């Protein structure tokens, strides 16, 4: 047992293993210890995959890198490509034209919405929603709930909900439960009434059909989704308004109109389906007293800051970043990805090796040499682990820290940062502040009043650092991203109509024009938090390429000082209804939206 970061870790209780952790991207193992009353008193995050992209990149052409690193992940598809082209452009002093900037922003915000909404419905919802309970719902009362939760959503009739319920009934009655097989249905950890479950399952199905439409924005600008194409110096999707037949361009007015139609659909979905569902589900779990899962969000949060309303002008970031420590929201520290003393990665408890593992390496000096070795207290063998030994090396995820501090990253971090910035007088963060205040009022008062529940008085400081808050911030971010790209579209079309059709700067395309050595960094507010790629170029080739990815931060194992990362902190001090059913573990881990391929790359 030891104390760290205000957490009292204790591994003397009953050990529980969850492997595989499902409804995430990629491969994770989680172990906990629970006390005499089933409360988690120790948590262990193990990334169970590695591919070695950083090693693979060595010696290759910086212009090709984006395509390699894009394949770090097909869920957060394109965010690595964006980080890569930004890193190369930074190294080579390339400035992209305005249309390329706007198209990249639109693609980024499309990813945010798609990734967030699919995460919530298809990966997260089953931690809050009992599908079997949905079978018991009254269709008319479900219709009535839908009208209260979201008056503007037109899919609300009792007949509609009855038809969806009937299809679910027949599916279950077949005896082939598919994705619902061996689920935790009926657990006392589930608190929703049947009608809320049926509404949510209905939206799960609605979202599954709709998500394929949103990504057509990627398809127009980047050729395909998953894995749209990017370009060092701009975008490949050249613009020509008059061009028809043999002279047809990738982007004309009809293509832009198509994009706008998709953006308008996104805005409807976020406002009418996604945000109201999370507000309602959040309210009901709040009423049940389920405010667990805050972890590091209560103290230390970080993001690089993103979405400048003026390109290359960081003061205009619409999700302004930095770092908060010790839960002091009155002080945002600036974060500099170039500073060797700020972002560093340890491998003390990871399956890698450094010359000296008492130090953390800034990614320009990063090293990725695998070292799969298990500690003396392991139960099992090298190829058959029964209980992992967290006192030694226990993960394929490195341990990123900021000035030595363990930080949480992600939409929640960005929303806490936005709130802090707005309170200091930052006008660019007005919208997220407005969303947060609106959400707190809905959760505390409006939804309770509508549902005949007691009104509560939680502050944002109390509500946000929780698994509910983390889930809320993601939904709000989706909505904000849809709104922003609606504006970006207008700016893009206006710029083109004013006569600027440029999409690529090719002045430094040819490596004969490059400095003989250079270093660069590209950062992105990726769906799961703070993403950075750090590159060193020598004689036209990649000398070093290091990625520090959002789930690397959140899912990280302990560092040299034994400080825990966001996943482990979040599980601490949570009661489990049944230690053998990982309902609460999944609910909280899933609230970070773990991407394990991203975390390990």
């Amino acid at each position: 047992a030891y104390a760290t970061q205000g957490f009292n870790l204790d591994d003397r209780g009953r050990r529980i293993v969850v492997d595989p952790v499902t409804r995430i991207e990629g491969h994770m193992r989680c172990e906990v210890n629970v006390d005499a009353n089933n409360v988690i008193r120790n948590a262990v995050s193990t990334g169970t995959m590695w591919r070695g992209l950083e090693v693979i990149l060595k010696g290759r052409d910086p212009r090709d890198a984006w395509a390699f690193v894009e394949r770090i992940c097909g869920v957060c598809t394109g965010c690595h490509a964006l980080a890569s082209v930004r890193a190369v452009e930074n190294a080579l002093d390339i400035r992209i034209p305005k249309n390329a900037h706007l198209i990249r922003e639109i693609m980024a915000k499309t990813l945010q919405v798609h990734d967030h909404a699919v995460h919530f419905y298809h990966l997260h919802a089953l931690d809050w929603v009992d599908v079997m309970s949905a079978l018991k719902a009254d269709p008319k009362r479900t219709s009535e709930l839908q009208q209260l939760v979201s008056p503007a959503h037109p899919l609300s009739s009792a007949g509609y909900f009855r038809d969806i319920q009937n299809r679910l009934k027949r599916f279950v009655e077949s005896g082939q439960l598919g994705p619902f097989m061996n689920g935790y249905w009926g657990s006392k950890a589930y608190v929703l009434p049947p009608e809320a479950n049926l509404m949510a399952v209905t939206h799960y199905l609605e979202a599954l059909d709709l998500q394929k439409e949103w990504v057509k924005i990627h398809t127009i600008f980047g050729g395909k989704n998953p894995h749209p194409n990017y370009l060092v110096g701009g975008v490949p999707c050249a613009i020509n308004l008059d061009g028809i037949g043999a002279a047809s361009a990738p982007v004309n007015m009809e293509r832009l109109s198509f994009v706008k139609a998709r953006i308008d659909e996104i805005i409807e979905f976020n406002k009418n389906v996604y945000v109201p569902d999370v507000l309602a589900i959040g309210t009901l779990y709040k009423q049940a007293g389920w405010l667990y899962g805050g972890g590091l969000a209560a103290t230390n949060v970080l993001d690089y800051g993103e979405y400048p309303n003026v390109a290359y002008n960081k003061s205009t970031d619409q999700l302004p970043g930095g770092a908060i420590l010790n839960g002091n929201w009155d002080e945002v520290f600036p974060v500099d990805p170039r500073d060797s003393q700020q972002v560093q990665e340890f491998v003390s408890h990871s399956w890698y090796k450094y010359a000296d593992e008492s130090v953390g390496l800034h990614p320009w000096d990063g090293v990725t040499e695998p070292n799969y070795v298990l500690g003396a207290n392991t139960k099992g063998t090298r190829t058959r682990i029964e209980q992992i030994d967290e006192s030694a090396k226990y993960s394929w995820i490195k341990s990123p820290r900021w000035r030595g501090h363990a930080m949480e990253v992600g939409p929640l971090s960005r929303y806490i940062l936005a709130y802090a910035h707005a309170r200091s007088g930052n006008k660019y963060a007005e919208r997220p502040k407005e969303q947060l205040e609106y959400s707190a009022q809905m959760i505390n008062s409006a939804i309770p009043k509508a549902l005949g529940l007691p009104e509560t008085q939680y502050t944002l400081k109390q509500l946000l650092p929780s698994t509910i808050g983390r889930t809320l911030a993601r939904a709000l971010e989706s909505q904000y991203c849809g709104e922003m790209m609606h504006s970006d579209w207008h700016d893009l079309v206006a710029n083109i109509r004013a006569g600027d059709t440029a999409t690529a700067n090719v002045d430094k395309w040819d490596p004969a024009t490059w400095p003989l050595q250079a270093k660069g960094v590209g950062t992105v507010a990726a769906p799961r938090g703070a993403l950075g790629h750090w590159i060193r170029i020598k004689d036209g080739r990649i000398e070093n390429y290091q990625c520090v990815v959002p789930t690397t931060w959140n899912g990280s194992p302990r560092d040299y000082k034994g400080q825990i990362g966001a996943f482990e902190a979040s599980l601490m001090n949570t009661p489990m209804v049944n230690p053998e059913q990982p309902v609460e573990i999944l609910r909280t881990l899933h609230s970070f939206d773990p991407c394990l391929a991203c975390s390990t790359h």
Partner: protein
């Protein structure tokens, strides 16, 4: 009853799973609810840990020789296989276990088919395609990074309707989707035929949709349905949106030189 599908994930990026759910015809919703029984899939399944693993034995026993194994990603042979761990054990052990009683095996995507990005030089994990590990079972390769959504659901639809693997080429790819090179029906082909090429990004030629051969397009050597079926319900494909094909459905495409270096000859 609906044919059980056990969908395993090795080393991967999950692009094939994402592509699958983009399918418009048929909808992935209809595939899952009405066509297959998707009994194991890390991405979507309710059960975790012990409850998830217990599904595999149950389905393999009840549907012995009558379930489909779908594999996304691939097994690593280095690090004693523990660069991909499932249930405390190497992925390769799960793969071999589930494969033994499958009636057919689908290798989804370039990862499972050939190795894809993790197998690019110097392949630190010795990531190895499924057909090099499973050598005694019928395997259909559906390559591409990822494959087109309707190609994936088209393969499933054929297999379920006919209880057969469709006709394959010598590389194990379904002829119904991989018989054409991109360059055969690429809409920029008339420009190629006239020697009309983009030479620099966003040049006048690029704005007129000239051929991308000199910008490195690997369409002439790449077999896929991208030029005709296209992507995301026929919305575009890489070339239509202005970037050359990078050869993503072909074996070892990461190690055939820069994406921007033109083909020779």
């Amino acid at each position: 009853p609906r044919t059980p599908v056990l969908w395993l994930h090795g080393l991967e990026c999950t692009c094939c799973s994402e592509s699958f759910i983009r399918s418009a015809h048929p909808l992935a919703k209809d595939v899952v609810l009405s066509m297959i029984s998707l009994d194991y899939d890390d991405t979507l399944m309710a059960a975790a840990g012990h409850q998830a693993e217990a599904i595999l034995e149950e389905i393999m026993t009840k549907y012995k020789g009558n379930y489909i194994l779908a594999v996304e990603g691939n097994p690593p042979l280095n690090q004693d296989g523990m660069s991909c761990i499932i249930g405390g054990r190497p992925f390769i052990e799960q793969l071999k276990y589930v494969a033994k009683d499958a009636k057919a095996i689908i290798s989804w995507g370039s990862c499972a088919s050939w190795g894809c990005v993790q197998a690019a030089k110097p392949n630190p994990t010795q990531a190895t395609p499924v057909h090099k590990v499973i050598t005694d079972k019928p395997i259909i390769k559906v390559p591409g990074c990822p494959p087109i959504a309707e190609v994936m659901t088209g393969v499933i639809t054929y297999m379920l309707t006919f209880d057969r693997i469709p006709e394959l080429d010598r590389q194990g790819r379904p002829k119904m989707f991989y018989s054409q090179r991109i360059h055969d029906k690429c809409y920029r082909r008339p420009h190629f035929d006239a020697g009309q090429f983009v030479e620099e990004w966003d040049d006048e030629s690029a704005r007129k949709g000239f051929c991308l051969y000199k910008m490195g397009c690997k369409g002439p050597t790449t077999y896929n349905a991208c030029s005709t079926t296209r992507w995301n319900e026929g919305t575009s494909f890489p070339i239509q949106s202005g970037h050359g094909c990078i050869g993503c459905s072909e074996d070892g495409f990461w190690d055939k030189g820069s994406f921007y270096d033109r083909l020779t000859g």
